[PDB]
Amino acid sequence: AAQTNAPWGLARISSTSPGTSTYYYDESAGQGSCVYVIDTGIEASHPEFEGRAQMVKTYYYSSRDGNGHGTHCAGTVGSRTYGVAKKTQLFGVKVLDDNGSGQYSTIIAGMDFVASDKNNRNCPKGVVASLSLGGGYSSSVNSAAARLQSSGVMVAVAAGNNNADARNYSPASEPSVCTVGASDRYDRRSSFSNYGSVLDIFGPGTDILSTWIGGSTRSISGTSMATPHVAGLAAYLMTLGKTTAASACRYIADTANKGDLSNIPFGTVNLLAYNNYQA
C-alpha cells in the first residue's frame, strides 16, 4: 500500500533514502495487534482513530487527554493519516496529568497495569507499549519496564531530550527495553536527542505531524515522537509474523538502515528504523 503526501517520518520508515514523501506498507497494517500508549491519555473520539482507540486506565480525575501529548503519540502509532500501523488497536493509560507530569509511582503502576491488562484484551498478533516519558535514573522505574517487557510486551521508550547520555535517565536506561533516539528529515541526529550505548534505534523525531486534541493536528519534536514510530513499527512487524514481542527491538535493529545518520556520537548505534517493505 502507498500513502501519498505522508508525514516525512512515515515516508522515512519505509525508505532507504531521506527526502521522499510516500509511505509504503503492507496493508495488514498492524491488524490484530495492540499498542498501549502510556502518557497523558488519548482523545479517542478523534476521527483519525476510527474507533480503534480507547482509554483503559487513568490515575487522575479524568481519562481525557487535556494536554495533547498522548494523543499526538498515539496518532503516530496508529492514526489513519499520521500512523505507522493504521489498523492496530490503541489503548490509552493516563499516567501523566494534563501538564504532562507524573509521579514515578504512578508510572510504575501503569506499567504493571499493562502487563496484566493485556490478558483482558484481544491481541492475537502481539502487544506493544509506547512510553514517551522519562526522568532521572530510577532503578524501580527501570525494573517496572523490565517486568513489562518480560511479561510479553514489546516496550519502546524515549531516550530523552537532554542531548546527553541516556544512561542517567529512566526508563531510557533499562537495557532490556527498546530505547529510541530521534532523527530529523535530513538524517541528522535531532539536536535534543539523548545518545549513548543504551540506545537501540533511532526514529523520526523532529517536526512530526500527528493528531492533537480538539480534533486537530500539529507538528512537534522530541524523542517522544520517535518512540511511537518504533512502537507502531513493532506492531506492524508482529502482525506480519516477522518478529515477536521479545525480539522485536533486536529485529528492528537488525533490519534498520545502517550508517545513514550524521552527528551520531562515537559509541552510539547508527541505526534508523525501517520496515523493509518491498511494494
Method: X-ray
Rg over alpha carbons for the chain, rounded to the nearest Å, is 16
Active site residue 26: no
In a domain, 279, yes or no: no
Active site residue 150: no
- Rounded Cα distance between 183 and 199, Å, is 13
Place of cell 516477522: 242
Domain count, the chain: 1
> Could you say which of 132, 151, 183, 224 is catalytic?
224
Report the 3 state secondary structure along the chain.
CEECCCCHHHHHHCCCCCCCCCEECCCCCCCCEEEEEEECCCCCCCHHHCCCEEEEEECCCCCCCCCCHHHHHHHHHHCCCCCCCCCCEEEEEECCCCCCCCCHHHHHHHHHHHHHHHHHCCCCCEEEEEECCCEECCHHHHHHHHHHHHCCEEEEEECCCCCCEHHHEECCCCCCCEEEEEECCCCEECCCCCECCCCCEEEECCCEEEEECCCEEEEECCHHHHHHHHHHHHHHHHHCCCCCCCCHHHHHHHCCEECCCECCCCCCCCEECCCCCCC
Would the annotation count 97 as a binding residue? no
Specify the CATH number for the domain of residue 188: 3.40.50.200
Would the annotation count 84 as a binding residue? no
Structural domain including 116 reads: 2-272
Would the annotation count 177 as a binding residue? yes
Would the annotation count 95 as a binding residue? no
In a domain, 55, yes or no: yes
CA angle, residues 135, 128, 175, in degrees to nearest 5: 50
Buried-exposed string 169-180: b where 16+ CB fall within 10 A, e elsewhere: bbbbbbebbbbb
- Rounded Cα distance between 232 and 85, Å, is 5
Contact 90, 74 (CB under 8 A): yes
Show the cell assigned to 214. Answer: 480538539
Active site residue 46: no
> Could you say which of 39, 97, 98, 184 is catalytic?
39
How many CB atoms are closer than 10 A to CB 137?
15
In a domain, 44, yes or no: yes
In a domain, 278, yes or no: no
Would the annotation count 260 as a binding residue? yes
> Could you say which of 46, 69, 72, 229 is catalytic?
69
Show the cell assigned to 44. Answer: 479517542
Contact 154, 30 (CB under 8 A): no
